[PDB]
RNA sequence: AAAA
């Protein structure tokens, strides 16, 4: 109720975008229901929210080919590469254009 | 462009980074990661992009836990393989730990 | 709290 996920399918990743309605407390990490994804595709995590929410979510998709964190300045920065891409690679995605 | 300060405690290693100027994602290919005592959890702290924080949290996932410093709260546990649970907050004040300047 |  403080938080909601939009899950968008793309060829090479699933986009997971969160929207925080009101300021969250860390106790929420114990209660959050994470979106299920196609585990054969990497994940791009997007949203305006605390660094600890991002780190929590990135860890929760570590079992996928890669995890990329959305930077509105750049695209999605690969922060974990298990089976695909390299850390520091940028995926050319504009999340604002998908959501608008 | 970015340097590390390693602060050894009994309960955790505090890794604090400092950025001299804006970094580019390419830096993640070049960064040398401080080695830690892997039998103690890690607290990550610093002023930098969310992707840097996520990159560092994953690089210390082989330790008992990874906590991310929030100046409003303390160190929020984002990963645990210890008594600590995700969403637990470690009472640290990094601003006070760093007073007087730490060599990076 | 998308460069705590």
PDB file of C-alpha atoms (C1' of nucleotides) in Angstrom:
ATOM      1  CA  UNK A   1       0.000   0.000   0.000  1.00  0.00           C
ATOM      2  CA  UNK A   2       3.114   2.275   0.503  1.00  0.00           C
ATOM      3  CA  UNK A   3       4.603   0.699  -2.715  1.00  0.00           C
ATOM      4  CA  UNK A   4       3.606  -0.807  -6.140  1.00  0.00           C
ATOM      5  CA  UNK A   5       5.472  -2.621  -8.975  1.00  0.00           C
ATOM      6  CA  UNK A   6       5.037  -2.309 -12.738  1.00  0.00           C
ATOM      7  CA  UNK A   7       6.499  -5.356 -14.574  1.00  0.00           C
ATOM      8  CA  UNK A   8       7.258  -4.738 -18.287  1.00  0.00           C
ATOM      9  CA  UNK A   9       8.509  -7.528 -20.640  1.00  0.00           C
ATOM     10  CA  UNK A  10      11.373  -6.729 -23.078  1.00  0.00           C
ATOM     11  CA  UNK A  11      13.390  -9.091 -25.376  1.00  0.00           C
ATOM     12  CA  UNK A  12      16.582  -9.114 -23.243  1.00  0.00           C
ATOM     13  CA  UNK A  13      15.230  -8.199 -19.747  1.00  0.00           C
ATOM     14  CA  UNK A  14      12.236  -7.702 -17.499  1.00  0.00           C
ATOM     15  CA  UNK A  15      11.814  -4.047 -16.351  1.00  0.00           C
ATOM     16  CA  UNK A  16      10.695  -3.928 -12.665  1.00  0.00           C
ATOM     17  CA  UNK A  17       9.621  -0.329 -11.799  1.00  0.00           C
ATOM     18  CA  UNK A  18       8.453   0.540  -8.218  1.00  0.00           C
ATOM     19  CA  UNK A  19       6.330   3.585  -7.231  1.00  0.00           C
ATOM     20  CA  UNK A  20       6.458   4.652  -3.545  1.00  0.00           C
ATOM     21  CA  UNK A  21       3.222   6.512  -2.529  1.00  0.00           C
ATOM     22  CA  UNK A  22       4.484   7.530   0.987  1.00  0.00           C
ATOM     23  CA  UNK A  23       7.898   7.343   2.733  1.00  0.00           C
ATOM     24  CA  UNK A  24       8.823   3.702   3.533  1.00  0.00           C
ATOM     25  CA  UNK A  25      10.493   2.264   6.656  1.00  0.00           C
ATOM     26  CA  UNK A  26      13.109  -0.527   6.430  1.00  0.00           C
ATOM     27  CA  UNK A  27      10.692  -2.955   8.265  1.00  0.00           C
ATOM     28  CA  UNK A  28       8.919  -3.063   4.804  1.00  0.00           C
ATOM     29  CA  UNK A  29      11.764  -5.314   3.402  1.00  0.00           C
ATOM     30  CA  UNK A  30      10.324  -8.086   5.719  1.00  0.00           C
ATOM     31  CA  UNK A  31       6.767  -7.683   4.185  1.00  0.00           C
ATOM     32  CA  UNK A  32       7.375  -6.791   0.439  1.00  0.00           C
ATOM     33  CA  UNK A  33       6.101  -9.286  -2.182  1.00  0.00           C
ATOM     34  CA  UNK A  34       8.727  -9.269  -5.046  1.00  0.00           C
ATOM     35  CA  UNK A  35       7.483  -9.741  -8.658  1.00  0.00           C
ATOM     36  CA  UNK A  36       8.151 -13.255 -10.143  1.00  0.00           C
ATOM     37  CA  UNK A  37      10.043 -12.935 -13.459  1.00  0.00           C
ATOM     38  CA  UNK A  38      11.261 -15.064 -16.323  1.00  0.00           C
ATOM     39  CA  UNK A  39      14.547 -16.214 -14.624  1.00  0.00           C
ATOM     40  CA  UNK A  40      16.086 -16.842 -18.081  1.00  0.00           C
ATOM     41  CA  UNK A  41      16.128 -13.019 -18.681  1.00  0.00           C
ATOM     42  CA  UNK A  42      18.060 -10.350 -16.743  1.00  0.00           C
ATOM     43  CA  UNK A  43      16.243  -7.678 -14.704  1.00  0.00           C
ATOM     44  CA  UNK A  44      16.360  -3.842 -14.865  1.00  0.00           C
ATOM     45  CA  UNK A  45      15.254  -2.277 -11.525  1.00  0.00           C
ATOM     46  CA  UNK A  46      13.775   1.279 -11.691  1.00  0.00           C
ATOM     47  CA  UNK A  47      12.202   3.659  -9.160  1.00  0.00           C
ATOM     48  CA  UNK A  48      12.609   6.745  -6.937  1.00  0.00           C
ATOM     49  CA  UNK A  49      13.380   5.205  -3.558  1.00  0.00           C
ATOM     50  CA  UNK A  50      16.035   4.607  -0.930  1.00  0.00           C
ATOM     51  CA  UNK A  51      19.433   3.062  -1.906  1.00  0.00           C
ATOM     52  CA  UNK A  52      18.654   0.167   0.551  1.00  0.00           C
ATOM     53  CA  UNK A  53      15.390  -0.689  -1.376  1.00  0.00           C
ATOM     54  CA  UNK A  54      17.413  -0.829  -4.636  1.00  0.00           C
ATOM     55  CA  UNK A  55      20.167  -3.020  -3.015  1.00  0.00           C
ATOM     56  CA  UNK A  56      17.483  -5.293  -1.466  1.00  0.00           C
ATOM     57  CA  UNK A  57      15.722  -5.781  -4.873  1.00  0.00           C
ATOM     58  CA  UNK A  58      19.009  -6.214  -6.830  1.00  0.00           C
ATOM     59  CA  UNK A  59      19.973  -9.067  -4.441  1.00  0.00           C
ATOM     60  CA  UNK A  60      16.480 -10.659  -4.915  1.00  0.00           C
ATOM     61  CA  UNK A  61      17.169 -11.047  -8.719  1.00  0.00           C
ATOM     62  CA  UNK A  62      20.798 -12.311  -8.343  1.00  0.00           C
ATOM     63  CA  UNK A  63      19.546 -15.768  -9.570  1.00  0.00           C
ATOM     64  CA  UNK A  64      18.887 -14.224 -13.110  1.00  0.00           C
ATOM     65  CA  UNK A  65      21.462 -13.685 -15.916  1.00  0.00           C
ATOM     66  CA  UNK A  66      22.190 -10.050 -14.859  1.00  0.00           C
ATOM     67  CA  UNK A  67      20.830  -7.191 -12.761  1.00  0.00           C
ATOM     68  CA  UNK A  68      20.902  -3.593 -14.052  1.00  0.00           C
ATOM     69  CA  UNK A  69      19.931  -0.486 -12.038  1.00  0.00           C
ATOM     70  CA  UNK A  70      18.136   2.323 -13.911  1.00  0.00           C
ATOM     71  CA  UNK A  71      19.887   5.756 -13.909  1.00  0.00           C
ATOM     72  CA  UNK A  72      17.623   8.369 -15.633  1.00  0.00           C
ATOM     73  CA  UNK A  73      20.888  10.122 -16.784  1.00  0.00           C
ATOM     74  CA  UNK A  74      22.350   7.105 -18.651  1.00  0.00           C
ATOM     75  CA  UNK A  75      20.153   3.985 -19.064  1.00  0.00           C
ATOM     76  CA  UNK A  76      20.367   0.789 -16.979  1.00  0.00           C
ATOM     77  CA  UNK A  77      23.822   0.164 -15.452  1.00  0.00           C
ATOM     78  CA  UNK A  78      24.726  -3.542 -15.147  1.00  0.00           C
ATOM     79  CA  UNK A  79      25.703  -4.029 -11.439  1.00  0.00           C
ATOM     80  CA  UNK A  80      25.710  -7.901 -11.473  1.00  0.00           C
ATOM     81  CA  UNK A  81      26.629 -10.157 -14.441  1.00  0.00           C
ATOM     82  CA  UNK A  82      26.138 -13.911 -13.736  1.00  0.00           C
ATOM     83  CA  UNK A  83      25.783 -15.324 -17.263  1.00  0.00           C
ATOM     84  CA  UNK A  84      25.384 -12.242 -19.550  1.00  0.00           C
ATOM     85  CA  UNK A  85      26.771  -8.652 -20.124  1.00  0.00           C
ATOM     86  CA  UNK A  86      29.591  -7.066 -17.996  1.00  0.00           C
ATOM     87  CA  UNK A  87      29.377  -4.934 -14.810  1.00  0.00           C
ATOM     88  CA  UNK A  88      29.527  -1.294 -15.941  1.00  0.00           C
ATOM     89  CA  UNK A  89      27.748  -1.930 -19.309  1.00  0.00           C
ATOM     90  CA  UNK A  90      24.769   0.437 -19.929  1.00  0.00           C
ATOM     91  CA  UNK A  91      21.463  -0.850 -21.410  1.00  0.00           C
ATOM     92  CA  UNK A  92      19.860   1.869 -23.596  1.00  0.00           C
ATOM     93  CA  UNK A  93      16.394   2.020 -21.980  1.00  0.00           C
ATOM     94  CA  UNK A  94      14.295   5.188 -21.303  1.00  0.00           C
ATOM     95  CA  UNK A  95      11.858   4.148 -18.504  1.00  0.00           C
ATOM     96  CA  UNK A  96      10.140   7.591 -18.435  1.00  0.00           C
ATOM     97  CA  UNK A  97       9.043   7.042 -22.109  1.00  0.00           C
ATOM     98  CA  UNK A  98       7.682   3.534 -21.266  1.00  0.00           C
ATOM     99  CA  UNK A  99       5.729   4.943 -18.219  1.00  0.00           C
ATOM    100  CA  UNK A 100       4.527   8.048 -20.245  1.00  0.00           C
TER     101      UNK A 100
ATOM    102  CA  UNK B   1      37.863   9.652  -9.209  1.00  0.00           C
ATOM    103  CA  UNK B   2      36.662   7.392  -6.276  1.00  0.00           C
ATOM    104  CA  UNK B   3      38.573   6.174  -3.126  1.00  0.00           C
ATOM    105  CA  UNK B   4      37.729   3.849  -0.180  1.00  0.00           C
ATOM    106  CA  UNK B   5      38.115   4.125   3.642  1.00  0.00           C
ATOM    107  CA  UNK B   6      38.095   0.748   5.493  1.00  0.00           C
ATOM    108  CA  UNK B   7      36.926   0.991   9.170  1.00  0.00           C
ATOM    109  CA  UNK B   8      37.314  -2.341  11.044  1.00  0.00           C
ATOM    110  CA  UNK B   9      34.838  -3.029  13.892  1.00  0.00           C
ATOM    111  CA  UNK B  10      34.187  -6.311  15.775  1.00  0.00           C
ATOM    112  CA  UNK B  11      30.560  -6.449  14.437  1.00  0.00           C
ATOM    113  CA  UNK B  12      31.227  -5.330  10.798  1.00  0.00           C
ATOM    114  CA  UNK B  13      33.598  -3.789   8.352  1.00  0.00           C
ATOM    115  CA  UNK B  14      32.523  -0.260   7.319  1.00  0.00           C
ATOM    116  CA  UNK B  15      33.463   0.466   3.665  1.00  0.00           C
ATOM    117  CA  UNK B  16      33.057   4.235   2.975  1.00  0.00           C
ATOM    118  CA  UNK B  17      33.724   5.508  -0.558  1.00  0.00           C
ATOM    119  CA  UNK B  18      34.399   9.116  -1.659  1.00  0.00           C
ATOM    120  CA  UNK B  19      33.892  10.435  -5.251  1.00  0.00           C
ATOM    121  CA  UNK B  20      36.201  13.363  -6.341  1.00  0.00           C
ATOM    122  CA  UNK B  21      34.182  14.105  -9.565  1.00  0.00           C
ATOM    123  CA  UNK B  22      31.228  12.501 -11.459  1.00  0.00           C
ATOM    124  CA  UNK B  23      31.867   8.800 -12.316  1.00  0.00           C
ATOM    125  CA  UNK B  24      30.888   6.905 -15.483  1.00  0.00           C
ATOM    126  CA  UNK B  25      29.516   3.311 -15.327  1.00  0.00           C
ATOM    127  CA  UNK B  26      32.761   2.096 -17.069  1.00  0.00           C
ATOM    128  CA  UNK B  27      34.479   2.617 -13.626  1.00  0.00           C
ATOM    129  CA  UNK B  28      32.833  -0.661 -12.418  1.00  0.00           C
ATOM    130  CA  UNK B  29      35.247  -2.562 -14.791  1.00  0.00           C
ATOM    131  CA  UNK B  30      38.341  -0.812 -13.202  1.00  0.00           C
ATOM    132  CA  UNK B  31      37.440  -0.446  -9.413  1.00  0.00           C
ATOM    133  CA  UNK B  32      39.688  -2.375  -6.961  1.00  0.00           C
ATOM    134  CA  UNK B  33      37.364  -3.648  -4.103  1.00  0.00           C
ATOM    135  CA  UNK B  34      38.855  -3.518  -0.551  1.00  0.00           C
ATOM    136  CA  UNK B  35      39.434  -7.061   0.817  1.00  0.00           C
ATOM    137  CA  UNK B  36      37.673  -7.609   4.177  1.00  0.00           C
ATOM    138  CA  UNK B  37      37.453 -10.244   6.926  1.00  0.00           C
ATOM    139  CA  UNK B  38      34.774 -12.397   5.167  1.00  0.00           C
ATOM    140  CA  UNK B  39      33.573 -13.757   8.560  1.00  0.00           C
ATOM    141  CA  UNK B  40      32.214 -10.262   9.431  1.00  0.00           C
ATOM    142  CA  UNK B  41      29.331  -8.473   7.655  1.00  0.00           C
ATOM    143  CA  UNK B  42      29.817  -5.272   5.647  1.00  0.00           C
ATOM    144  CA  UNK B  43      28.287  -1.746   5.976  1.00  0.00           C
ATOM    145  CA  UNK B  44      28.572   0.247   2.705  1.00  0.00           C
ATOM    146  CA  UNK B  45      28.448   4.075   2.916  1.00  0.00           C
ATOM    147  CA  UNK B  46      29.072   6.948   0.523  1.00  0.00           C
ATOM    148  CA  UNK B  47      27.597   9.688  -1.678  1.00  0.00           C
ATOM    149  CA  UNK B  48      27.266   8.132  -5.099  1.00  0.00           C
ATOM    150  CA  UNK B  49      24.912   6.711  -7.704  1.00  0.00           C
ATOM    151  CA  UNK B  50      22.502   3.887  -6.714  1.00  0.00           C
ATOM    152  CA  UNK B  51      24.259   1.595  -9.281  1.00  0.00           C
ATOM    153  CA  UNK B  52      27.610   1.991  -7.446  1.00  0.00           C
ATOM    154  CA  UNK B  53      25.923   1.037  -4.115  1.00  0.00           C
ATOM    155  CA  UNK B  54      24.258  -1.988  -5.768  1.00  0.00           C
ATOM    156  CA  UNK B  55      27.585  -3.030  -7.395  1.00  0.00           C
ATOM    157  CA  UNK B  56      29.367  -2.852  -4.002  1.00  0.00           C
ATOM    158  CA  UNK B  57      26.526  -4.680  -2.073  1.00  0.00           C
ATOM    159  CA  UNK B  58      26.821  -7.629  -4.552  1.00  0.00           C
ATOM    160  CA  UNK B  59      30.700  -7.676  -4.229  1.00  0.00           C
ATOM    161  CA  UNK B  60      30.266  -8.239  -0.401  1.00  0.00           C
ATOM    162  CA  UNK B  61      27.366 -10.781  -0.682  1.00  0.00           C
ATOM    163  CA  UNK B  62      29.903 -13.575   0.202  1.00  0.00           C
ATOM    164  CA  UNK B  63      30.014 -12.119   3.826  1.00  0.00           C
ATOM    165  CA  UNK B  64      27.433 -12.835   6.601  1.00  0.00           C
ATOM    166  CA  UNK B  65      25.365  -9.690   5.727  1.00  0.00           C
ATOM    167  CA  UNK B  66      25.416  -6.428   3.741  1.00  0.00           C
ATOM    168  CA  UNK B  67      23.937  -3.215   5.212  1.00  0.00           C
ATOM    169  CA  UNK B  68      23.535   0.101   3.405  1.00  0.00           C
ATOM    170  CA  UNK B  69      24.009   3.338   5.368  1.00  0.00           C
ATOM    171  CA  UNK B  70      21.032   5.742   5.451  1.00  0.00           C
ATOM    172  CA  UNK B  71      21.851   9.010   7.314  1.00  0.00           C
ATOM    173  CA  UNK B  72      18.190   9.148   8.505  1.00  0.00           C
ATOM    174  CA  UNK B  73      18.253   5.651  10.151  1.00  0.00           C
ATOM    175  CA  UNK B  74      21.559   3.784  10.467  1.00  0.00           C
ATOM    176  CA  UNK B  75      22.742   0.848   8.312  1.00  0.00           C
ATOM    177  CA  UNK B  76      19.764  -0.978   6.744  1.00  0.00           C
ATOM    178  CA  UNK B  77      20.366  -4.747   6.295  1.00  0.00           C
ATOM    179  CA  UNK B  78      19.601  -5.572   2.580  1.00  0.00           C
ATOM    180  CA  UNK B  79      21.077  -9.175   2.658  1.00  0.00           C
ATOM    181  CA  UNK B  80      21.594 -11.558   5.648  1.00  0.00           C
ATOM    182  CA  UNK B  81      23.091 -15.042   6.153  1.00  0.00           C
ATOM    183  CA  UNK B  82      23.380 -14.259   9.931  1.00  0.00           C
ATOM    184  CA  UNK B  83      21.146 -13.558  13.000  1.00  0.00           C
ATOM    185  CA  UNK B  84      20.393 -10.162  11.248  1.00  0.00           C
ATOM    186  CA  UNK B  85      17.182 -10.036   9.124  1.00  0.00           C
ATOM    187  CA  UNK B  86      16.619  -7.899   5.974  1.00  0.00           C
ATOM    188  CA  UNK B  87      15.104  -4.566   7.106  1.00  0.00           C
ATOM    189  CA  UNK B  88      16.947  -4.638  10.500  1.00  0.00           C
ATOM    190  CA  UNK B  89      18.846  -1.352  11.175  1.00  0.00           C
ATOM    191  CA  UNK B  90      22.383  -1.308  12.651  1.00  0.00           C
ATOM    192  CA  UNK B  91      22.915   1.752  14.937  1.00  0.00           C
ATOM    193  CA  UNK B  92      25.875   3.510  13.259  1.00  0.00           C
ATOM    194  CA  UNK B  93      26.403   7.264  12.558  1.00  0.00           C
ATOM    195  CA  UNK B  94      29.007   7.400   9.770  1.00  0.00           C
ATOM    196  CA  UNK B  95      29.162  11.243   9.958  1.00  0.00           C
ATOM    197  CA  UNK B  96      30.493  10.804  13.549  1.00  0.00           C
ATOM    198  CA  UNK B  97      32.810   7.842  12.634  1.00  0.00           C
ATOM    199  CA  UNK B  98      34.462  10.037   9.888  1.00  0.00           C
ATOM    200  CA  UNK B  99      34.892  13.206  12.054  1.00  0.00           C
ATOM    201  CA  UNK B 100      38.513  14.506  11.811  1.00  0.00           C
ATOM    202  CA  UNK B 101      38.960  12.945   8.325  1.00  0.00           C
ATOM    203  CA  UNK B 102      39.801   9.340   7.361  1.00  0.00           C
ATOM    204  CA  UNK B 103      42.605   8.404   4.915  1.00  0.00           C
ATOM    205  CA  UNK B 104      40.957   6.860   1.769  1.00  0.00           C
TER     206      UNK B 104
ATOM    207  C1'   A C   1      14.529   8.833  -1.704  1.00  0.00           C
ATOM    208  C1'   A C   2      17.262   6.992  -8.914  1.00  0.00           C
ATOM    209  C1'   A C   3      24.839  11.070  -6.817  1.00  0.00           C
ATOM    210  C1'   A C   4      22.850   8.098   0.502  1.00  0.00           C
TER     211        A C   4
END
